[PDB]
Amino acid sequence: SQILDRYDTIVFDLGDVLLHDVRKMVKHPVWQDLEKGLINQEFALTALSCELETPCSKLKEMLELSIASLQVNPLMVEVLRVLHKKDKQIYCLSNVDLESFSYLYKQFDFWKYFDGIYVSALLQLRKPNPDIFQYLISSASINTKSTIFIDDKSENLQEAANFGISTLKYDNFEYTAIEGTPEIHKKRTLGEDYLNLRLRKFPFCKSFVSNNVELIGGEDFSKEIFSTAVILHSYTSLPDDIIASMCHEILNHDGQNKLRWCFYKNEARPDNFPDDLDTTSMVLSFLLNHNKLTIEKIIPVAEQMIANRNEEGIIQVYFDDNRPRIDAIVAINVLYLMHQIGYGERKELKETEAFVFDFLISKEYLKGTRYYPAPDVFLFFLSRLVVDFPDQFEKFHKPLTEMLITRVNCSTFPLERALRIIALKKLGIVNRVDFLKLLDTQLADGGWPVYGLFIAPRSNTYFGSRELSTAFALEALHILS
C-alpha cells in the first residue's frame, strides 16, 4: 500500500491478520495464564477440564483441531514481504501460548520477514495491556511517530494509538494517522561492578572443580586458559583495560606451541595431555578478531585440524592420534575458525558440518555433548556460528530457532537461562521470561552463582566460575536491555 510506505516501522498482529466452540476455552481466565507463559498446556487443559466440565482429551482435540485449521492470509503475507524488501523495521506482536507458538513457527515461513518477534508467552505480558506496548517500544527503541500497527481488534489499536502509533484496522482497511526499570539498571550496575573487580584482580579467569554441575564443595583450580577465552568471546562489553589484561594472559599462556594451545597451564598439565582443538580454535578465533594474528599464521594450524578427521570424516577433539574423540561443540568452534579464515568451502569439512547439523536435528543434543552436558550450551554455540556466517549456514536457522523456542524457561540454572536469552535474541526472538528469572538469581554482591560449564569426562570433573556465570548473565541483560 501507499500508506505503509510512509512509516519506518510496521508492527503486525498474527491472529486474523497473517493467519485466519473453542472460544469458551480461549476466553477463560486460565487460558490467559497460558497465553502469558505462566503455565503449560498440560496444566491449563487439566484446569479447564474442570471448569468447562469437558473431558481433558476433548479440549485437547478441540485445540489441536483449532490450531491445524489455521491458514495463511496470502494478501497480508505478500504485504509483509514487500515491506521487508523496502528495508522496513518489521515486528510481530501477538498473544499466543508457547506450544502453539512452536507449532506455528514450524508450520509457516513468513517469520523471516520480521526483525523481531514479541509473543505473549515469552514476555509474560498480554496484548491489550499497555505494559506490552511499552515493553515493545523501549526494547525495540521504536520511534512511535514513524510506526504503524496492524491489528483486527480495536482494543489493541486504541492502546497503541495512546502511545502515539498510527493504526490500520484489518474487506475494509481502516487507517488512522496518529500524531500524539531502575531495578534493571541497579542489577546491571552491581553485576558489572562485580565482574570488573573479579577480572581486574584475576585477568586469568579463575575456575573451580567438583563432581557436580553446581560445583558444591568445589576446590579452586585456576590453571586453565579456556575460561578466559570463553569470556572474551561471550561477554562483548568488557572495558578496554580488562580486554587487554585478558588478551595478555592468552598471548603469554605457556601451554602454547606453534599456535596450538593446551587447556592447562604447564604446571597443571597431566603427563602426556595433548593440545586440543577447542582451546586452540577459541583462542585463535579471538586473536584473529583482535588483530593479534593473521590468517597466514593461522591457516597451517587449520590444516592440522583438517588432518585430524576420523574414519567417518569428522574432525576430532585432540591433536593426538591415540586419543580419538568427537564433540559437537568442538566441531562448531572448529568450523567457526574455518569460515573466519577462508576455509569455509573446503570439502573436507562436509562431514563435520553434517555431524553438527544432525546432532541438532535428531534432538540428540538433548543428551548433551561429551564435554558439555547441558543442551542449551550446544544451542548457544551453534547460534554464534549460524548468526555470524548466515549465508553459509542458512539451513540451520529455522531448525535451531525451533529447538530454542521449545526450551524457553525449561531449566532454572542462571547460566542456562542466559544462553537461551542470548541465542534467541540473536535469532530475533525476545525471551523476557528467562530474563526476568535470571535477574532474580543474582546474589547480593552482584555475581551469579558458579556453574559447571564443561567437564573432563575421564575424571567426571566439572569446571566453572562465578566469572563465567556473571559474564553470560550480563550479556543476556545487555542484549535485552
Binding site for ligand BTM (CB under 6 A): 226, 263, 276, 278-279, 317, 330, 371, 454, 456
**Cα(248)–Cα(203) distance, integer angstroms:** 9
The DSSP string of 103-130 is HHHHH---GGG-SEEEEHHHHT--TTSH
Report, in Å, the least distance between residue 43 CB and ligand BTM. 24
Give the E-state strand segments of 345-424 in sequence order. Answer: none
The site partner of 180 among its own copies, ligand BTM, Mg ion, none (C-beta below 5 to 8 Å per kind) is none
Report, in Å, the least distance between residue 356 CB and ligand BTM.
15
- Contact status, residue 417 vs residue 426, Cβ threshold 8 Å: no
466 binds its own copies (CB under 8 A): yes
Cβ-based nearer residue to ligand BTM, 278 or 353: 278
Instruction: Pick what 15 binds: Mg ion, ligand BTM, its own copies, none; C-beta below 5 to 8 Å, kind-dependent.
Output: Mg ion
CB of 275 to ligand BTM, least distance (A): 9
E-assigned strand segments in 105-234: 116-119, 147-151, 166-169, 174-176, 208-210, 219-220
Say how many Å lie between the first and final Cα of the chain, rounded. Answer: 33
Which is closer to ligand BTM, CB of 114 or CB of 380?
380
Cβ nearer to ligand BTM, comparing 100 with 280: 280
Q: State yes or no: residue 219 binds its own copies (CB under 8 A).
A: yes
From the list ligand BTM, Mg ion, its own copies, none, pick the one residue 182 interacts with, judged by a Cβ distance below 5 to 8 Å according to partner type. Answer: none
Interacting residues with its own copies between 76 and 135 (CB under 8 A) = none
Establish if 444 lies at the interface with its own copies (CB under 8 A).
yes
Any idea which residue has 575421564 for its cell? 458
DSSP helix/strand/coil, 210: strand
List 169's β-bridge partners, or say none. 151, 174
User: Nine-digit cell at 134?
Assistant: 511499552
| Residue 15 beta carbon to ligand BTM: minimum distance, rounded to whole angstroms | 44
Nearest 10 degrees: Cα torsion 306, 342, 292, 415: -70
Binder of residue 22, out of ligand BTM, its own copies, Mg ion, none (CB less than 5 to 8 A by kind): none
Does 216 engage in binding with its own copies (CB under 8 A)? yes
Q: Least separation, in Å, of the C-beta of 189 and Mg ion?
A: 31
Stretch that binds its own copies, among 38-46, 86-94, 274-282, 376-384 (CB under 8 A): 38-46
Considering only the stretches 64-72, 74-82, 161-169, 217-225, report the one whose residues sit in contact with its own copies under the rule CB under 8 A.
217-225
Q: Burial, 177: exposed, middle or buried (Cβ in 10 Å; 0-12, 13-18, 19+)? A: exposed
Rounded CA separation 210/191 (Å) = 25
Q: Does 64 bind its own copies (CB under 8 A)?
A: no
Which of 368-382 are b and which e, b meaning 16 or more Cβ less than 10 Å from the residue's Cβ? bbebbbbbbbbbbbb
Can residue 16 be called a binding residue for its own copies (CB under 8 A)?
no
Give me the amino acid identity at 29. Answer: P
> Of the two residues 214 and 348, which places its CB atom closer to its own copies in the complex?
214
Residue 257 binds its own copies (CB under 8 A): no
Positions of E strands within 1-95: 9-12, 89-94
Could you tell which of Mg ion, its own copies, ligand BTM, none binds residue 215, using a CB distance below 5 to 8 A set by kind?
its own copies
Give the interface with Mg ion as residue ranges (CB under 5 A). Answer: 13, 15-16, 152
Binding of its own copies by 53 (CB under 8 A): yes
The set of cell numbers assigned to 157 is 489499536
Q: What is the Cα–Cα distance from 432 to 441, expressed in whole angstroms?
A: 15
DSSP 448-471: PPP-EEEEEGGGTEEEE-HHHHHH
Give the integer Cα–Cα distance in Å for 368 and 328: 9
Residue 13: contacted member of ligand BTM, Mg ion, its own copies, none (CB under 5 to 8 Å, by partner type): Mg ion
Residue from 187, 188, 206, 432 that binds its own copies (CB under 8 A)?
Answer: 206
Question: Using CB distances below 5 to 8 A depending on partner kind, what does residue 468 bind out of its own copies, ligand BTM, Mg ion, none?
Answer: none
The answer to whether 140 touches 428, Cβ cutoff 8 Å, is: no
Where does this chain bind its own copies (CB under 8 A)? 28-30, 32-33, 39, 42-43, 45-47, 49-51, 53, 55-57, 206, 208, 214-220, 443-445, 447, 449-450, 465-466
